[model samples]
Target: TMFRELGSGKLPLQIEQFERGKTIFFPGDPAERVYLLVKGAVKLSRVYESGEEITVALLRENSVFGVLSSDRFYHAVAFTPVQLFSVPIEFMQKALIERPELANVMLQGLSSRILQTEMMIETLAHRDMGSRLVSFLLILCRDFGIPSPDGITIDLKLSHQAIAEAIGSTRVTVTRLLGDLRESKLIAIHKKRITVFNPVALSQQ
Candidate 1:
């Protein structure tokens, strides 16, 4: 009975706060609630039996986290500083029937997520590391882009490993491919930010 109320966003005060590298969902944590991101980026990742962390998704501000309806625990953890608005599973069930806009938002979020999954599947199945990297950059450019003096600036602060995970490749491969892209003058990496020099050429790659 209590779990349902928690899922409905009825008690916003119970929402937790986290900083970069702070873990939100552990490998075995009970999946009892869902979270709404209020700020920053969060990566959902899981460690394999071998203990290597495999990133599942890089969620940005306004993204939702956790799976309240699932009976089992979640397989991922948050990767960055995040502010989460936690809601209970029962609340989710009630809200779906009572709050139509909430339902619409949930459906929209799921649809977009599915589209992203499809893109990842296609990229991993048919594209090489170079092409995948390009596509990944394009995605970030579109998703987290902010106009600057030069061009679209991506706000995602991704580590090489995170990039590798997103592209379904190895870190070394991503690094080597990124180096090639740089040599070809396709992209410029400053600090942790990636600046696309020639997006057209990147698309071709």
Candidate 2:
């Protein structure tokens, strides 16, 4: 649906440039625009008043971010150099005039995100650290993995701190678990890339 509407060339979409570490939206900044990723990844995180950070989501190519209705502000941070197909409220109003189906697609996308949030709740509430780590790896495989003869390669270039925020664990805990997995020959970390060596066993655990 996104491709059908976006590739049609009928919409007045514009590519916008964003620098790395740019705070497109802060905790209290008004959310006046929506973005569709055209290049690079965007990390979405929120900071509490107590100075703790919680990673909400990561947006990759062909993904959308910064949806707002009840809330007036955007709550995510752009963690990398990125480019986005930007649409302001005025543009969305005009676009929906000609193509109402686009609204349904947007709603569906938001609904899918809600489901992911529900899964995150369940994972955080019930799963152990090891199980959580495996689930996180499987998700990374789906989003940013490359199939290799060995197994799926995670090429997201994420730091342990970033991953810790993602899985709602401490960096030390993640490090320990990764070490255990490495010792067990379940995965191999080479530089910043991770090659999953034993997908079947890891998935089964």
Candidate 3:
């Protein structure tokens, strides 16, 4: 049918755009705004080598961030041209009263975010690269997959190197494993993006 969508509609708040290849961090205590992504994609998550950094969550449109990000613990980076709806966190009480629907989406989004993070912990438990990568892919598909004619596609642009960091493998190793997965018909990759043929059946093995 159609791709899965989150956040039924907009929040009627102030808007801001974030472009790629730039720095966006939480600063300025003058105003703290909670942002709800309305367009484009971002992964407010990173580092590399020695497996130091980790991604807490993957983001798509309708994602409500800034709650956790208000602290310096997480980040807000743009992978594609993006826009957000912002409201001062202090005014959230009044904002929610007038826009009751926003509360529902927050819980919906936060719940899924938590589950993805929980799954992330599980993925690292898998010591083998193949199992770890596949576990990582299943969680991504569950959270961020878009329906494609071929299969369940992760529309976000990704690289072997980044994925390697996410799964604690190397780019070369991750590269070879992806090819193996493809040849086995477990997943498909093209131009650095991935698709899972059957996330459920894919999981059984």
Candidate 4:
């Protein structure tokens, strides 16, 4: 797996860690490296004049980005404290020649993420609070979900303010919204981590 290949130091990849809310790189910085998320989540987005940082992607474990070009178009930040594998784009291309699986991995990671990114934008669009939060939570379930006997649990310990931050809702409103879900028994929270009892049904409902 990634741990073996990365920890054995076979490739010219460095495992880097970033604190939550820290930018991995901004627009002007050289997009010289391809990054693979080893742990935690990343927020990928574009920021504009309104000062409202709009999200494009919420990347979970094993996602890879910045392989398309050395010219970056979007901003990237650690959504949570994260561990990453970063190697120069040239180095990664060379490594792909050594291990063909690396190419498959990157392609697999990139393809689905693009689909998810568009879905993320839908959540951030002019959707209402209920639709927005549910859409956002579904994305989280796809990205960071852990299967349990009863439900699919979101792996992160997220706060109402944090969820509000992502969905552009107020904390008080987020609390009320989440509480409604809890009372509906479609979702549950324990220790600040949320679980969707029936993700398919939740989305359909």
- Which numbered prediction scores highest in lDDT against the true structure? 4
Off by over 4 Å in 1: 1-13, 45-56, 68-74, 98-100
Give TM per candidate: 0.76, 0.76, 0.68, 0.77
Q: What tens-digit string does per-residue lDDT give for candidate 2 at 39-112?
A: 77666666666666655556556567766635533355554578887777667766766776778767765775
Q: How high is the lDDT of residue 90 in model 4?
A: 82
RMSD values, in order shown: 4.7, 3.8, 6.1, 3.7
Residue 145 error for model 1, in Å?
1.9
Error of 3 at 39 (Å): 2.6
Per-residue error for 193 in candidate 4, Å, reads 1.7
Please tell me which model should have the higher TM-score, number 2 or number 4.
4
Angstrom error of the Cα, residue 93, model 1: value is 1.9
Could you tell me how far off, in angstroms, the CA of residue 201 lies in candidate 4 after the best superposition?
A: 2.2
| Superior candidate under TM-score, 2 versus 3 | 2
Give Cα-based local distance difference scores for all models.
0.67, 0.68, 0.69, 0.80
Model 3 agreement with the true structure over 1-205: per-residue lDDT tens digits:
0211232334346778877634345333333677777887555654444445666555667877776422445555665568877776656656556667667877977886676567677888887889888987876676568999988998767768767766878999989998899999888888868999868788654
Residue 201, candidate 2: C-alpha displacement in angstroms: 3.1
Cα-based lDDT at residue 132, candidate 2: 76
Top model number, TM-score: 4
Model 2 spans > 4 angstroms off: 1-14, 17-23, 45-53, 70-74, 78-81, 198-200
